Short mmCIF file of N, CA, C and O in Angstrom, two decimals:
data_model
loop_
_atom_site.label_atom_id
_atom_site.label_comp_id
_atom_site.label_asym_id
_atom_site.label_seq_id
_atom_site.Cartn_x
_atom_site.Cartn_y
_atom_site.Cartn_z
N UNK A 392 19.15 14.20 11.45
CA UNK A 392 19.12 12.90 12.10
C UNK A 392 18.45 13.04 13.46
O UNK A 392 18.69 14.02 14.18
N UNK A 393 17.61 12.08 13.81
CA UNK A 393 16.90 12.07 15.08
C UNK A 393 17.18 10.76 15.81
O UNK A 393 17.20 9.69 15.20
N UNK A 394 17.38 10.85 17.12
CA UNK A 394 17.66 9.69 17.96
C UNK A 394 16.75 9.72 19.18
O UNK A 394 16.67 10.74 19.87
N UNK A 395 16.07 8.61 19.44
CA UNK A 395 15.17 8.47 20.58
C UNK A 395 15.50 7.18 21.32
O UNK A 395 15.48 6.11 20.71
N UNK A 396 15.79 7.29 22.61
CA UNK A 396 16.22 6.15 23.41
C UNK A 396 15.20 5.86 24.51
O UNK A 396 14.56 6.76 25.04
N UNK A 397 15.08 4.58 24.84
CA UNK A 397 14.17 4.09 25.87
C UNK A 397 14.54 2.65 26.17
O UNK A 397 15.37 2.04 25.49
N UNK A 398 13.91 2.09 27.21
CA UNK A 398 14.16 0.72 27.64
C UNK A 398 12.84 -0.03 27.63
O UNK A 398 11.89 0.37 28.32
N UNK A 399 12.78 -1.14 26.89
CA UNK A 399 11.55 -1.89 26.68
C UNK A 399 11.80 -3.35 27.02
O UNK A 399 12.93 -3.82 27.07
N UNK A 400 10.70 -4.07 27.27
CA UNK A 400 10.77 -5.50 27.53
C UNK A 400 11.07 -6.26 26.24
O UNK A 400 10.99 -5.73 25.13
N UNK A 401 11.42 -7.54 26.40
CA UNK A 401 11.71 -8.37 25.25
C UNK A 401 10.49 -8.84 24.50
O UNK A 401 10.61 -9.32 23.36
N UNK A 402 9.31 -8.72 25.10
CA UNK A 402 8.07 -9.18 24.48
C UNK A 402 7.35 -8.09 23.69
O UNK A 402 6.31 -8.36 23.10
N UNK A 403 7.89 -6.87 23.66
CA UNK A 403 7.25 -5.76 22.97
C UNK A 403 8.22 -5.05 22.03
O UNK A 403 8.03 -3.88 21.70
N UNK A 404 9.27 -5.75 21.60
CA UNK A 404 10.24 -5.16 20.68
C UNK A 404 9.61 -4.94 19.31
O UNK A 404 9.88 -3.93 18.65
N UNK A 405 8.77 -5.87 18.87
CA UNK A 405 8.23 -5.84 17.52
C UNK A 405 7.30 -4.66 17.27
O UNK A 405 7.10 -4.28 16.11
N UNK A 406 6.72 -4.08 18.31
CA UNK A 406 5.67 -3.08 18.12
C UNK A 406 6.20 -1.75 17.62
O UNK A 406 5.40 -0.88 17.25
N UNK A 407 7.52 -1.55 17.60
CA UNK A 407 8.08 -0.30 17.10
C UNK A 407 7.86 -0.17 15.60
O UNK A 407 7.76 0.94 15.07
N UNK A 408 7.78 -1.30 14.89
CA UNK A 408 7.61 -1.25 13.44
C UNK A 408 6.29 -0.58 13.08
O UNK A 408 5.30 -0.72 13.80
N UNK A 409 6.24 0.17 11.98
CA UNK A 409 5.00 0.86 11.61
C UNK A 409 3.89 -0.13 11.30
O UNK A 409 4.12 -1.22 10.78
N UNK A 410 2.66 0.27 11.64
CA UNK A 410 1.50 -0.57 11.44
C UNK A 410 1.23 -1.56 12.54
O UNK A 410 0.20 -2.25 12.50
N UNK A 411 2.12 -1.67 13.53
CA UNK A 411 1.91 -2.59 14.64
C UNK A 411 0.87 -2.03 15.60
O UNK A 411 0.93 -0.87 16.00
N UNK A 412 -0.08 -2.88 15.98
CA UNK A 412 -1.13 -2.52 16.92
C UNK A 412 -0.93 -3.30 18.21
O UNK A 412 -0.84 -4.53 18.19
N UNK A 413 -0.86 -2.59 19.33
CA UNK A 413 -0.63 -3.23 20.61
C UNK A 413 -0.64 -2.20 21.72
O UNK A 413 -0.86 -1.01 21.50
N UNK A 414 -0.39 -2.70 22.93
CA UNK A 414 -0.54 -1.86 24.12
C UNK A 414 0.47 -0.72 24.13
O UNK A 414 0.10 0.45 24.29
N UNK A 415 1.75 -1.03 23.96
CA UNK A 415 2.78 0.00 24.05
C UNK A 415 2.78 0.90 22.83
O UNK A 415 3.22 2.06 22.92
N UNK A 416 2.28 0.43 21.70
CA UNK A 416 2.28 1.20 20.46
C UNK A 416 1.00 2.01 20.27
O UNK A 416 0.85 2.65 19.22
N UNK A 417 0.09 1.99 21.23
CA UNK A 417 -1.13 2.78 21.14
C UNK A 417 -1.22 3.91 22.15
O UNK A 417 -1.84 4.93 21.86
N UNK A 418 -0.61 3.76 23.33
CA UNK A 418 -0.73 4.75 24.38
C UNK A 418 0.60 5.39 24.78
O UNK A 418 0.58 6.34 25.57
N UNK A 419 1.73 4.91 24.28
CA UNK A 419 3.02 5.47 24.63
C UNK A 419 3.78 6.03 23.44
O UNK A 419 4.20 7.19 23.48
N UNK A 420 3.97 5.25 22.38
CA UNK A 420 4.83 5.66 21.29
C UNK A 420 4.62 4.73 20.10
O UNK A 420 4.55 3.51 20.27
N UNK A 421 4.54 5.32 18.90
CA UNK A 421 4.46 4.54 17.68
C UNK A 421 4.95 5.39 16.51
O UNK A 421 4.93 6.62 16.58
N UNK A 422 5.37 4.71 15.43
CA UNK A 422 5.90 5.34 14.24
C UNK A 422 4.80 5.52 13.19
O UNK A 422 3.85 4.73 13.14
N UNK A 423 4.91 6.54 12.35
CA UNK A 423 3.92 6.73 11.28
C UNK A 423 4.08 5.67 10.20
O UNK A 423 5.05 4.91 10.16
N UNK A 424 3.08 5.63 9.31
CA UNK A 424 3.08 4.63 8.24
C UNK A 424 4.25 4.84 7.28
O UNK A 424 4.83 3.87 6.78
N UNK A 425 4.61 6.09 7.01
CA UNK A 425 5.68 6.42 6.08
C UNK A 425 7.01 6.65 6.79
O UNK A 425 7.81 7.49 6.36
N UNK A 426 7.25 5.93 7.88
CA UNK A 426 8.49 6.10 8.63
C UNK A 426 9.69 5.73 7.76
O UNK A 426 9.65 4.78 6.98
N UNK A 427 10.76 6.51 7.90
CA UNK A 427 12.01 6.26 7.20
C UNK A 427 13.14 6.16 8.21
O UNK A 427 13.27 7.02 9.09
N UNK A 428 13.95 5.11 8.09
CA UNK A 428 15.01 4.87 9.04
C UNK A 428 14.88 3.51 9.69
O UNK A 428 14.21 2.63 9.14
N UNK A 429 15.50 3.32 10.85
CA UNK A 429 15.43 2.04 11.54
C UNK A 429 15.86 2.21 12.99
O UNK A 429 16.29 3.28 13.42
N UNK A 430 15.73 1.11 13.74
CA UNK A 430 16.03 1.08 15.16
C UNK A 430 17.02 -0.04 15.43
O UNK A 430 17.13 -1.01 14.68
N UNK A 431 17.76 0.11 16.53
CA UNK A 431 18.70 -0.90 17.00
C UNK A 431 18.36 -1.25 18.44
O UNK A 431 18.24 -0.36 19.28
N UNK A 432 18.19 -2.54 18.71
CA UNK A 432 17.85 -3.02 20.04
C UNK A 432 18.87 -4.05 20.49
O UNK A 432 19.28 -4.91 19.71
N UNK A 433 19.28 -3.96 21.75
CA UNK A 433 20.25 -4.90 22.31
C UNK A 433 19.99 -5.05 23.80
O UNK A 433 19.40 -4.18 24.44
N UNK A 434 20.45 -6.17 24.34
CA UNK A 434 20.20 -6.49 25.74
C UNK A 434 20.97 -5.55 26.66
O UNK A 434 22.13 -5.22 26.41
N UNK A 435 20.31 -5.13 27.74
CA UNK A 435 20.93 -4.31 28.77
C UNK A 435 20.77 -4.97 30.14
O UNK A 435 20.69 -4.29 31.16
N UNK A 436 20.72 -6.31 30.16
CA UNK A 436 20.55 -7.03 31.41
C UNK A 436 21.71 -6.79 32.37
O UNK A 436 21.54 -6.86 33.59
N UNK A 437 22.90 -6.52 31.83
CA UNK A 437 24.07 -6.32 32.68
C UNK A 437 23.98 -5.01 33.45
O UNK A 437 24.35 -4.95 34.63
N UNK A 438 23.50 -3.94 32.80
CA UNK A 438 23.53 -2.61 33.38
C UNK A 438 22.16 -2.14 33.86
O UNK A 438 22.01 -1.78 35.03
N UNK A 439 21.15 -2.14 32.98
CA UNK A 439 19.85 -1.60 33.37
C UNK A 439 19.18 -2.46 34.43
O UNK A 439 18.61 -1.93 35.39
N UNK A 440 19.25 -3.78 34.29
CA UNK A 440 18.66 -4.66 35.29
C UNK A 440 19.45 -4.60 36.59
O UNK A 440 20.68 -4.59 36.58
N UNK B 978 -8.73 -3.83 3.95
CA UNK B 978 -7.92 -3.10 4.91
C UNK B 978 -8.15 -3.53 6.35
O UNK B 978 -7.25 -3.37 7.19
N UNK B 979 -9.32 -4.08 6.66
CA UNK B 979 -9.64 -4.46 8.03
C UNK B 979 -9.09 -5.83 8.41
O UNK B 979 -9.26 -6.25 9.56
N UNK B 980 -8.44 -6.54 7.48
CA UNK B 980 -7.91 -7.86 7.75
C UNK B 980 -6.42 -8.00 7.44
O UNK B 980 -5.88 -9.10 7.57
N UNK B 981 -5.76 -6.92 7.04
CA UNK B 981 -4.35 -6.99 6.66
C UNK B 981 -3.66 -5.70 7.08
O UNK B 981 -4.29 -4.64 7.14
N UNK B 982 -2.37 -5.80 7.36
CA UNK B 982 -1.62 -4.68 7.90
C UNK B 982 -1.52 -3.55 6.88
O UNK B 982 -1.26 -3.78 5.69
N UNK B 983 -1.71 -2.32 7.36
CA UNK B 983 -1.70 -1.15 6.48
C UNK B 983 -0.32 -0.80 5.97
O UNK B 983 -0.21 0.03 5.06
N UNK B 984 0.74 -1.40 6.53
CA UNK B 984 2.09 -1.08 6.08
C UNK B 984 2.31 -1.55 4.65
O UNK B 984 2.91 -0.85 3.83
N UNK B 985 1.81 -2.74 4.31
CA UNK B 985 1.99 -3.30 2.97
C UNK B 985 0.67 -3.57 2.27
O UNK B 985 0.65 -4.25 1.24
N UNK B 986 -0.44 -3.04 2.79
CA UNK B 986 -1.72 -3.16 2.10
C UNK B 986 -1.69 -2.46 0.74
O UNK B 986 -2.52 -2.77 -0.12
N UNK B 987 -0.75 -1.54 0.54
CA UNK B 987 -0.58 -0.92 -0.76
C UNK B 987 -0.20 -1.94 -1.82
O UNK B 987 -0.55 -1.78 -3.00
N UNK B 988 0.50 -3.01 -1.43
CA UNK B 988 0.95 -4.00 -2.40
C UNK B 988 -0.24 -4.72 -3.03
O UNK B 988 -0.32 -4.87 -4.25
N UNK B 989 -1.18 -5.17 -2.20
CA UNK B 989 -2.31 -5.93 -2.72
C UNK B 989 -3.25 -5.06 -3.55
O UNK B 989 -3.74 -5.49 -4.59
N UNK B 990 -3.50 -3.83 -3.10
CA UNK B 990 -4.37 -2.95 -3.88
C UNK B 990 -3.69 -2.55 -5.19
O UNK B 990 -4.36 -2.30 -6.19
N UNK B 991 -2.35 -2.49 -5.20
CA UNK B 991 -1.64 -2.20 -6.44
C UNK B 991 -1.88 -3.30 -7.47
O UNK B 991 -2.06 -3.02 -8.66
N UNK B 992 -1.86 -4.56 -7.03
CA UNK B 992 -2.23 -5.65 -7.92
C UNK B 992 -3.67 -5.55 -8.38
O UNK B 992 -4.04 -6.16 -9.39
N UNK B 993 -4.50 -4.79 -7.66
CA UNK B 993 -5.91 -4.64 -7.98
C UNK B 993 -6.19 -3.40 -8.83
O UNK B 993 -7.01 -3.47 -9.75
N UNK B 994 -5.54 -2.28 -8.54
CA UNK B 994 -5.77 -1.07 -9.32
C UNK B 994 -5.22 -1.24 -10.73
O UNK B 994 -5.81 -0.76 -11.71
N UNK B 995 -4.08 -1.92 -10.87
CA UNK B 995 -3.51 -2.15 -12.20
C UNK B 995 -4.41 -3.05 -13.03
O UNK B 995 -4.67 -2.77 -14.21
N UNK B 996 -4.91 -4.13 -12.43
CA UNK B 996 -5.78 -5.04 -13.17
C UNK B 996 -7.09 -4.39 -13.57
O UNK B 996 -7.57 -4.59 -14.68
N UNK B 997 -7.68 -3.61 -12.66
CA UNK B 997 -8.91 -2.90 -12.99
C UNK B 997 -8.68 -1.87 -14.09
O UNK B 997 -9.48 -1.76 -15.02
N UNK B 998 -7.59 -1.12 -13.99
CA UNK B 998 -7.30 -0.11 -15.01
C UNK B 998 -6.98 -0.76 -16.35
O UNK B 998 -7.35 -0.23 -17.40
N UNK B 999 -6.29 -1.90 -16.33
CA UNK B 999 -5.89 -2.54 -17.57
C UNK B 999 -7.10 -2.99 -18.38
O UNK B 999 -7.11 -2.88 -19.61
N UNK B 1000 -8.13 -3.51 -17.70
CA UNK B 1000 -9.32 -3.94 -18.42
C UNK B 1000 -10.08 -2.77 -19.01
O UNK B 1000 -10.71 -2.91 -20.06
N UNK B 1001 -10.03 -1.60 -18.36
CA UNK B 1001 -10.64 -0.42 -18.95
C UNK B 1001 -9.95 -0.05 -20.26
O UNK B 1001 -10.60 0.42 -21.20
N UNK B 1002 -8.63 -0.26 -20.34
CA UNK B 1002 -7.91 0.00 -21.58
C UNK B 1002 -8.40 -0.90 -22.70
O UNK B 1002 -8.54 -0.44 -23.84
N UNK B 1003 -8.65 -2.17 -22.41
CA UNK B 1003 -9.07 -3.10 -23.45
C UNK B 1003 -10.40 -2.69 -24.06
O UNK B 1003 -10.58 -2.77 -25.28
N UNK B 1004 -11.34 -2.24 -23.23
CA UNK B 1004 -12.65 -1.84 -23.74
C UNK B 1004 -12.54 -0.64 -24.66
O UNK B 1004 -13.24 -0.57 -25.68
N UNK B 1005 -11.68 0.33 -24.32
CA UNK B 1005 -11.53 1.51 -25.17
C UNK B 1005 -10.96 1.13 -26.53
O UNK B 1005 -11.45 1.59 -27.57
N UNK B 1006 -9.93 0.28 -26.54
CA UNK B 1006 -9.32 -0.10 -27.81
C UNK B 1006 -10.31 -0.83 -28.71
O UNK B 1006 -10.23 -0.70 -29.94
N UNK B 1007 -11.24 -1.58 -28.13
CA UNK B 1007 -12.27 -2.22 -28.94
C UNK B 1007 -13.15 -1.18 -29.63
O UNK B 1007 -13.48 -1.33 -30.81
N UNK B 1008 -13.52 -0.12 -28.91
CA UNK B 1008 -14.38 0.90 -29.50
C UNK B 1008 -13.69 1.63 -30.64
O UNK B 1008 -14.34 2.02 -31.62
N UNK B 1009 -12.38 1.84 -30.54
CA UNK B 1009 -11.65 2.50 -31.62
C UNK B 1009 -11.72 1.68 -32.90
O UNK B 1009 -11.86 2.23 -34.00
N UNK B 1010 -11.62 0.36 -32.78
CA UNK B 1010 -11.70 -0.50 -33.96
C UNK B 1010 -13.10 -0.45 -34.56
O UNK B 1010 -13.27 -0.32 -35.78
N UNK B 1011 -14.13 -0.55 -33.72
CA UNK B 1011 -15.50 -0.57 -34.22
C UNK B 1011 -15.87 0.75 -34.88
O UNK B 1011 -16.53 0.76 -35.92
N UNK B 1012 -15.45 1.87 -34.29
CA UNK B 1012 -15.80 3.17 -34.85
C UNK B 1012 -15.21 3.36 -36.24
O UNK B 1012 -15.81 4.05 -37.07
N UNK B 1013 -14.05 2.76 -36.50
CA UNK B 1013 -13.47 2.86 -37.84
C UNK B 1013 -14.34 2.17 -38.88
O UNK B 1013 -14.51 2.68 -39.99
N UNK B 1014 -14.89 1.00 -38.54
CA UNK B 1014 -15.74 0.29 -39.49
C UNK B 1014 -17.05 1.03 -39.73
O UNK B 1014 -17.53 1.09 -40.86
N UNK B 1015 -17.63 1.60 -38.67
CA UNK B 1015 -18.88 2.35 -38.84
C UNK B 1015 -18.65 3.58 -39.71
O UNK B 1015 -19.45 3.89 -40.60
N UNK B 1016 -17.55 4.30 -39.47
CA UNK B 1016 -17.25 5.47 -40.29
C UNK B 1016 -17.03 5.07 -41.74
O UNK B 1016 -17.41 5.82 -42.66
N UNK B 1017 -16.43 3.91 -41.98
CA UNK B 1017 -16.30 3.42 -43.35
C UNK B 1017 -17.67 3.12 -43.95
O UNK B 1017 -17.92 3.42 -45.12
N UNK B 1018 -18.57 2.54 -43.16
CA UNK B 1018 -19.92 2.25 -43.64
C UNK B 1018 -20.82 3.47 -43.64
O UNK B 1018 -21.86 3.45 -44.31
N UNK B 1019 -20.47 4.52 -42.90
CA UNK B 1019 -21.25 5.75 -42.96
C UNK B 1019 -20.98 6.50 -44.26
O UNK B 1019 -21.91 7.04 -44.87
N UNK B 1020 -19.72 6.56 -44.68
CA UNK B 1020 -19.39 7.25 -45.92
C UNK B 1020 -19.96 6.54 -47.14
O UNK B 1020 -20.34 7.19 -48.11
N UNK B 1021 -20.01 5.20 -47.11
CA UNK B 1021 -20.62 4.48 -48.22
C UNK B 1021 -22.09 4.83 -48.36
O UNK B 1021 -22.59 5.02 -49.48
N UNK B 1022 -22.81 4.93 -47.24
CA UNK B 1022 -24.19 5.38 -47.30
C UNK B 1022 -24.28 6.84 -47.74
O UNK B 1022 -25.15 7.20 -48.54
N UNK B 1023 -23.38 7.68 -47.25
CA UNK B 1023 -23.38 9.08 -47.65
C UNK B 1023 -23.06 9.26 -49.12
O UNK B 1023 -23.38 10.31 -49.69
N UNK B 1024 -22.43 8.27 -49.75
CA UNK B 1024 -22.16 8.32 -51.18
C UNK B 1024 -23.32 7.77 -52.00
O UNK B 1024 -23.63 8.32 -53.06
N UNK B 1025 -23.96 6.70 -51.53
CA UNK B 1025 -25.11 6.15 -52.24
C UNK B 1025 -26.24 7.16 -52.32
O UNK B 1025 -26.90 7.29 -53.35
N UNK B 1026 -26.47 7.89 -51.22
CA UNK B 1026 -27.60 8.81 -51.17
C UNK B 1026 -27.32 10.10 -51.94
O UNK B 1026 -28.27 10.81 -52.28
#
């Protein structure tokens, strides 16, 4: 099992999915086409902000 | 591929590879039927001569 954590804006949540082309998914981090598994995203406005 | 996401582009080409392959099957089965009639007509000539 692998776990990777980070903090992203609300306008770039969708780019984690494989095949997504965009700014954050081209120069920082992206998943391969045959990715297996999933991600969980939730608001951290109370703590991180 | 240049107009649709590569994550599920396999789905559309699958509808295409199956259809292309299926028509190749039909042509072969036609030749098997025709060859049987020619072989029947070849032996008749081989008997007359």
